[PDB]
């Protein structure tokens, strides 16, 4: 029974926690402790295929957990999240991608670039910039809003689809 191990990474407060909780619990959490790293499971049907999602919601502690090491190693796909109204978070993406390639020691790691907070009118990272970056990386780019659930199933499911391709 297919389990997908997904790892959500990105600058603090881009909405890694809010996105994961939205997917798992179907509500938007305005305040989720920035430091709390946790894992979540959900059974979902994606393209008629039922699968188990096993999601690590990272909260970039510099505190050594054996679990987190195992997770980066055994994480099958990575959501690289930025906020569309946060330029720094976008600049950081490159760093996250690099890290993941180094951990996995591979140029072909299933990954999705996620522009979160699509609900905001105060956009500072245009879609085309994000699309250009994703294109350079040869990965999907998805716009999400954890607040409105826009593209939330899409982001996670797309990563699963990336993993499915990779495995097959």
């Amino acid at each position: 029974m297919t389990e997908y191990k997904l790892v959500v990474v990105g600058a603090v407060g881009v909405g890694k926690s809010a996105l994961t909780i939205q997917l798992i619990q179907n509500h938007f959490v305005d305040e989720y402790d920035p430091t709390i790293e946790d894992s979540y499971r959900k059974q979902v049907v994606i393209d008629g295929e039922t699968c188990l999602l096993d999601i690590l919601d990272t909260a970039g502690q510099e505190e050594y957990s054996a679990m987190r090491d195992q997770y980066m190693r055994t994480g099958e796909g990575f959501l690289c999240v930025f906020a569309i109204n946060n330029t720094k978070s976008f600049e950081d993406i490159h760093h996250y991608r690099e890290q993941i390639k180094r951990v996995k020691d591979s140029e072909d790691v299933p990954m999705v670039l996620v522009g979160n907070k699509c609900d905001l009118p105060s956009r500072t990272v245009d879609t085309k910039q994000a699309q250009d970056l994703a294109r350079s990386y040869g990965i999907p780019f998805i716009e999400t809003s954890a607040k409105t659930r826009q593209g939330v199933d899409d982001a996670f499911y797309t990563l699963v689809r990336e993993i499915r391709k990779h495995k097959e």
Partner: peptide, 8 residues
């Protein structure tokens, strides 16, 4: 990566 942290 964590496993040098930053060790040159």
């Amino acid at each position: 990566e964590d496993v040098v942290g930053g060790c040159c």
